[PDB]
């Protein structure tokens, strides 16, 4: 029926979504992972820098990304609670 | 009941899209404030180097130092973000 | 015609989802590109600092590589795109 295909529909809207909830926290899990590869490297570099320097007025500067990946993981987690079940 | 059942259905789908929508801004808008971070550390440490090799060269080849400029990419998520917002769903029930 | 208004909503849901799939597609593109260039640039700042300690005396430096993680948010990118959705 008529209904029946509004049914179908909602079912497909809900298996869409549900799968790009998926591709989602893929995303943010790995911009998560690079932002803390990227804050490491920096900071080792600016410690590399900073002890050739004081080998020898250079002050390097340290990246501090924790608050930022603590807000991306809580975006995942929401991301993972938003799940849809069709009753 | 399979009508008020989908309509329940219906409003649970606009629900759960709609918190959706708020984690992926939140994700979104944080990753740009991570990238304007890491885009001016990298830079204040580019012209750190590039002041020790200047000043150690005058007191042997230059080495060239690179920066970094992710203003058109914050624009485009705040772009990105400014759509999330205009995207939410509002029944009609 | 609460099934005529069913069926508007439900266009209306489809409708709207699609556009944020286009929204999330655009960020996650941009987020790639920064990252690119983040490791791009860090590296090269590394291998200038190298270079430099390297003749400065004729400190370990630290490389980065990002390119799994961007295979990924390409994926993501990929998924997100086939996520569309087709109301009969
Ligand atoms: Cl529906």
């Given at each position: 029926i008529t209904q029946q295909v509004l049914a179908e529909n909602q079912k497909l809207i809900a298996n869409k979504f549900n799968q790009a909830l998926g591709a989602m926290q893929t995303?943010?899990?790995?911009?998560?992972?690079?932002?803390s590869?990227?804050?490491?490297?920096?900071?080792?570099?600016?410690?590399?820098?900073?002890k050739l320097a004081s080998?020898?007025?250079?002050?390097?500067?340290?990246?501090?990304?924790?608050?930022?990946?603590?807000?991306l993981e809580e975006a995942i987690k929401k991301?993972?609670?938003?799940?849809?079940?069709?009753?």
């Open positions: 995303g943010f899990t790995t911009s998560n992972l690079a932002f590869k990227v804050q490491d490297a920096v900071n080792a570099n600016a410690n590399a820098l900073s080998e020898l007025q250079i002050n390097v500067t340290f990246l501090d990304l924790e608050y930022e990946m603590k807000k991301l993972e609670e938003s799940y849809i079940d069709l009753k």
